[PDB]
Structure formats: structure tokens, C-alpha cells
Amino acid sequence: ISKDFTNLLNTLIDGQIGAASRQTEWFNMSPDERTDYIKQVDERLQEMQQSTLSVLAAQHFQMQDNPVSVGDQLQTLQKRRQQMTDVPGTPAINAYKQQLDRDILLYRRQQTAMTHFDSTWRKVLVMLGPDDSKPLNATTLRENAVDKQAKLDTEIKRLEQQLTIQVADSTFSQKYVTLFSELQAYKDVNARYNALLKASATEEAAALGALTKVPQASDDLPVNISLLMMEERPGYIRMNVALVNASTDGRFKDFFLENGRLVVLTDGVLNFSFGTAARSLAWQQQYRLKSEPPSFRSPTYTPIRSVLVKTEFVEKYFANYLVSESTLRGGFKAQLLGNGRKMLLTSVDRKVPNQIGIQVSGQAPNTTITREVPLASALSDLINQNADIASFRTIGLEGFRQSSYHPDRDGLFVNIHELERSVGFAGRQYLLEMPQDNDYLSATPFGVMSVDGDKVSSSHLSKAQTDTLYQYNAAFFEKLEQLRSGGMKASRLFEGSIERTAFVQQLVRLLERNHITPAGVLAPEYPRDNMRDIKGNNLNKVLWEQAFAASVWRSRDNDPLLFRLATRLVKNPAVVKVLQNGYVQSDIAQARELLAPLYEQWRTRAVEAETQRVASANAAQHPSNPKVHVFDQAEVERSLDDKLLILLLTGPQSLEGTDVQLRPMVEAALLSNEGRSLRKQILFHALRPVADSFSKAAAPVNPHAELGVGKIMINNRLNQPDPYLILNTSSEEQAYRDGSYLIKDDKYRSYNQFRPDFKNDATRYMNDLDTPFVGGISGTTQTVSNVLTELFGGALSVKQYWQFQMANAAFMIRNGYHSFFETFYVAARYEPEGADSIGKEMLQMFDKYRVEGSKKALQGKLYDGVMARVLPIINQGLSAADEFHPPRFTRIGPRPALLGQAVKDL
């Protein structure tokens, strides 16, 4: 709001632009984007105050050990609040107080409900039991049956009536929770009593146990009381169902409002869930409670569909499922709807309670045979009966349409909006500064980020470090909070103040540490060629290279060459080494999913091997050890993954024996787009260890004078791992434990480990061309292309060569391993000698554009210069209708091609 804060932001913006080299996350903005940027700066600063400094305060204000107990939760929270009612007002403090208050309310409600449940249970057991002239026993309970079953029914009816009246109450209340707990107690005791009456002589003692076993240990709630605690308003639970994507064309499961009625787009969806989390994972770890398993949060990340539904419907069919306690459940349950239809309930998660797979099915309307079939309309109508028509909403829908607009791109993120939409997201974790070291460092509220050339870690904070971090950061945020309101008069950051300069020097590095920079947040509709990506690469060239990689990847053109390569390569013994790579294990899991019937049949074979292991361990003479008298999980898992790898490299023709009966299915699978793309994505990962296994020395065939004769200046990287981009992709919650941890090596880490070494001549060259930079000149591509004559066992045609090398370059761009240029440069250096070779020209063209780029923006001219020379060699055999043509670089963002495959019927 304050004009002074706005002038300060404009000052630091202008100054940081003026200081810029090439490759910077700042760039000059439109005079409209300026305001959206400042608005997002202010918003995200408020988010920081509410959502990271608050949780840091909740670990500074721990200097005295309050009374703490896992059972006395309500009292522990209450005294934690009374510890801090004296603390001065501050937004992080107010947010902490309000969170603790709401959690106090919830725990109070739950404890009340459990108490009145227990008292009602005891009361009903006294009512059903005999007089004190006899002990409570099954015989007297049976003698009581004919009267007190009807008494139980009468009380149940009365309670249901009174509670249905009380549902008119506008908010949760003592009477509401009371009557609810009574109704649940009466229902459960009635059910257990009737089970006892039905119990045989062998069951009777167990049913009497189940009656006398009050849940007074409070080790888990009554299920219906858990549903009560999930109620968003008295008598109603919030249902939700999560999409794969917004299904405007029917490709995805969906559930949407159509003509006032709610409509499921498909006959069942695996992705329903009920309730909502009471607090973020940050607060969950601050309380040091168990965090909800990630299999709830992992499976989808796009906007989610939700409405309030009548709790009676949920508790009728779905309370049978929703129990957190391990009641025996299979893969499925089938529920008779009163209209004669089935509803199928599906155990889509074997640990989490509150997410459900649901399907309705029944006798197909208006058909010659009474086949039962799934029925989306029946489910829609049943929901519309049980739903409230009011307060249907889609979570984040405008956010999606105002940041992604649609499923945007087939490649890595470009700004934080695409990151937060990406599968890697989990929750936005801002970092803050730990400046009392000799040079400034980044810490979470739980731990300071250890960084190393090989490794990234956090050391958890001891108390002195928490006091340092809190007091410093709080003093800074207090200054910022003053500046927004009391202005320069209050903050005393006068224009000549050394304190003002220190403040700005801190703010700029805060706004760098989190990618709140303009390239991080602006996400424009049509990218001006001035703008730069989140790493300071030119935006439009990155977009174009991604669209190129996508188009090359989707084409079916190179596949006859690549699968010949794979068919030969699979014979090398070294290919086994590929499977122990950490990144391959990301994607063979998807092959385990695609080939589920094979993955199951194979595993059902493999589990046999345990029997031979135990047999051999018993056949060994006088075994002094259970030498292998165990189920070795790792052995079978390795052998299974090796089988799946081999079945992915060589074609389905490799199938043999009984599995030939399944071979037509596997053939239909592997020829899908996801099949081909997996097959070649695993092929290219398999290529590197085989290439390395020849250990042939470097020997480029085209010399180049500008960049050192006979060598290449490969790799060319400085290891400078970005902590924010690491933590804002889903590491395990082991990072969040308040305990020291070593972070996962996700595939994006290869995209985030590296920063250009501006001292190297190769960097100077590339900065002259002003290409994007990702991991430097690709020594991997050198090592591969040096041995192609041995991989294929003979010289390639320049057509076959350039085909393979473009598929490789598309693979490198798709996974974010390198730029276009970082591959094609070493290609042109390695292109075989021959009558149609073109690398000599390509080198001279690079030099020609270098001597320009040091003065002028090339605006994609380099890419056209390359494609002009490559395309007529690739398409040399093809008809003009079937040629490949990449998307065409333009001032506006990359537009679709106008020729060949890309138009044919697409």
C-alpha cells in the first residue's frame, strides 16, 4: 500500500536490472506487468509471514518445557496457548494463536464426543444388564432380548428423530455432539447385542468380550465419531473427488455440474475422498504428530471437485470402507442399491482411510440380456439426491485457468506456477536466511540446508540456532511490516542510511533465494523475446526447444532405427548395470504398471523361488545357519526388474512359453504411444553404460579452432544446487521430521545441481551465442557418439546418423539434461566424414553467428540455420506429405508446423 515501499521496490528493480549481465532472472518489464509483480511480491511476503515465520515462532517459543503428553493433547495445547497469551501481537504470532485455537476447538469437540460416547455405552450396558442380584452374563442378556431389543429400537428411533430436528442448528453444539454420540453408542451396542444373540456357543464369549470391551483406552475413535469430526457442518460431510485433468473432452475421469444437477462424467472414479486436512504438513510436523501417508497426496495434483453430502449416505455404504483400523477388506466390496443396482467399492489405498474408489453398476437399461453394467447416470442421480446443490465448488479452478489455462506443455517447468502444478509439488515451502555464519545461508524452520558438490542435506536446529534464526528474521520482518504502514518515518530507512542499504541488500537476496523474481511469477500469455526463464535463459528459445523435443519424441519416424539399436544392444552383459541407476527406477515402475497382468504373472512365478531357496538351505549338509532359508525380497525384485527390462529392450517377440497366450495383449500394449515412448526412454538410459563400457578414447573427426583443437571443454559445470527448487519438489517427509536427512536424488536434481562456470572459455562462447544453458557441453553425447560404429557394428549413413542424433537430442532436451546446442555442437564435431557431411558448414555457421551475437540478439536465427541444413537430409527419402517438420520459431511463442505429419489429420 505505502508509496515508500513501492518506490523502494522500483529502486531495487531498476538497480538489479542495471547490474545485470546476460543470463539473469531479472528483465525489463511492461509498465503493467510491474504492478502484477509488485502485487505478487506483497502477497508472497504475507504468505511467508503467515506460513513459515509463524512455524519458526512455534519453535522459538519453547524455551520452557510446558507440560507435554500424548494423551493430554487438549491440555498441552491449552497451556501452550496460556504460555503465550503474554506474547506481543505480531502476524506470525496471531496466525499461530489462531491455528492453536482452532486445533483446541477440534480436540475439545472430539474429547467431549468420546466422553459422552463412553458414558452412553456404560449407561446402555447397565440398561441391558440384569439387576445387581445377578452378574452380567450372556444368559441374562438373552433373557432380556425380547423386551430390550425393542427398547433399543425405540431409543434409536427417538434419538434419530431428535438429532434430525437438531440438524436445524446452525453450528456444532453441545446438544448436537451429545445426541450424535448417544446415537452412535446406542447403534453400536445394539449391533453387538444382536450379534451376541446370534452368536453360537463358540462365538458367545467373544461377543460378550466385544460388549464388555468399551473403547476406554481411546486408542482409536468410533468410526462414526471420526466421521463426526470430519463434518464441515452439523449433519453434513464434505465429499470430494480428484481429477486426473479437467475433462473437457472426456479423456479423463471427471465430476461436474451440468444443468444444476451434478454429473459424473464416467461410471466410476478411483479418486474420491472425504473431509479435509485440519492443518498443513508444516504444522503437523510442528506438533510432531504422524503425518498422513503421501499415497493420499501423491496420486494427483490438478483441481479437485467437491460438494457437501448428507452424512447418513456416507455412513451407510462408505463407513463400511472408511475405517482407519485394519478391519479385513479385500480388493472390492459390492453394495446393493435399493433400485437393484450394485455399487462397487474399491480398496484403492491399503493404508489411508479417507480416499475411496467407487463404482455404480446394474442391469443395463433397455437391453436384450440382463447384463449388469456400470451406470454413471445412476450415480449422478443418487448423488444429486444425497448432495446439497449449494456450495458445489472446484478447488483452484480459476487458479488453473489463470496460470496453466490448459494442460500446457510436454516438458519441464519454466516458472513456479508450472512447478506448483507439476507432479513434483506437495506444498509451498518458503526458505529464510541464517545470516550469522561468515556468509549467508538458507534454513528451514526445522533445519539449516547443508550443501555439497555431491550431496544436499539439512542439519536440524539446536535451540541456540533457533533463537538466532527467529530473532534475526523477526527483526527483519518487523522492519518490513513497519515500512508497509509507518513508512520511512517509522522504519528510519532514510535514503542515506547504511541501515537502508543493508536492508535492501538483504531483501534482494531474499527475493533471489525464493524464486519470487519476475521470471518466476509473471507467466505471461505470449512470451516477448525479451523475457528470460527462471534460470535466465532466453524464454522463447526454451519454449521452442521444448516444443521441438516434444514433436520429435511423438513422431513415429526414427523408431525402426532405435528399436534395431535396442535389439542389438540388449545382448551386452553391461545392460544389467542400467537397472541399478537411480533415475531408471523412476520409469520402470511405469512399465510395471502398464504390464500389470505380466507383472503379476511374473511375480507369481518369482515367489516360487523362495521354496527352492528354503529347500536348498535344508538340503545343505547339517545346516549351521538358515543359509538362504528366507524369502529374499531383493533377489526376486531384482530378477523381476531385470525380466521387465529385457522385455522392454527386445520386442514382444521375446515372449515365450505360456505367456505367448498373453502376447497379443502385450503387443497391443507396447505399440501405444506411452509404450513406444517408455521403450525408447529406457533405451536411451540404457545407452550410456554400454557406451562407457567400450572405454574408447575421445577422437572428434572435425577440428574446431575457436574452442581448442582436438578437445571439447565438456561438462563445463559449476555445482551450485538450488535449495528452493530442491525443497519445492517432493522429498520424503523424513526431511520434515526435525531430524537430519539426506535429500532424494530426483530426476530434476540433474536439472538443478548445476550453474554455468562463467570463467570457462566454453561458457564465454555459449554466452556469446546466448543459447540456453543446462549442464554444459554434453560429454555424455561425446562418449556415446564416439562409439556408434561399434554399437551399430558398422558405419552409419549420414541419414541414419542424423536420425539417431536427433532422437538422442530430443531425449536430452525432454529430461532437462541439456540444451539443443549442447548436443548438436558435439554432433557437428562428430558427424562422420562423407560426401553429404555438413558439420563443416555448421561449425562455420556457429562462428558466423557468434561474431554477431556478441553485438545483437539472434532471435532464433541459429535454430533455423541448423534446421535448414538437417531437415533435407532427414526427409531425403520421404514424400512431401509425410516429411517431418519441426515447429517454427517466431517472435510470438512457438507456433505449430504447416507441413507433413504435423498437419496430416492433426
Side-chain angles (χ1 to χ4, degrees), residues 657-675:
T658 187
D659 306 301
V660 177
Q661 180 271 2
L662 182 62
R663 177 161 59 76
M665 156 53 57
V666 183
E667 287 180 17
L670 291 180
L671 302 183
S672 312
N673 294 334
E674 294 74 15

Side-chain angles (χ1 to χ4, degrees), residues 56 59-65 434 436 445-446 459-471 738:
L56 180 60
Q59 292 208 312
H60 176 63
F61 294 103
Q62 196 176 347
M63 182 171 69
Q64 301 178 339
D65 292 338
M434 189 167 187
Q436 185 178 2
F446 302 101
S459 180
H460 79 293
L461 311 174
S462 293
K463 68 185 182 182
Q465 292 73 14
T466 64
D467 299 333
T468 292
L469 190 73
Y470 176 74
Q471 191 278 348
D738 195 1

Side-chain angles (χ1 to χ4, degrees), residues 589-603 644 662 665 669:
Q590 184 165 359
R592 291 187 287 247
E593 179 183 327
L594 265 289
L595 300 185
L598 267 182
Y599 169 64
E600 186 62 29
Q601 178 151 305
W602 284 131
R603 182 155 34 62
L644 177 60
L662 182 62
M665 156 53 57

Side-chain angles (χ1 to χ4, degrees), residues 38 62 87 141 197 208 305 481 495 549 657 843 858 885 887:
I38 287 175
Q62 196 176 347
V87 175
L141 285 163
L197 301 175
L208 184 68
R305 308 288 203 191
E481 188 59 27
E495 299 193 324
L843 263 55
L858 297 180
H885 279 270

Side-chain angles (χ1 to χ4, degrees), residues 42 68 137 205 428 439 733 800 903:
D42 184 23
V68 168
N137 65 27
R428 182 154 62 217
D439 61 353
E733 295 75 13
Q800 291 163 305
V903 296

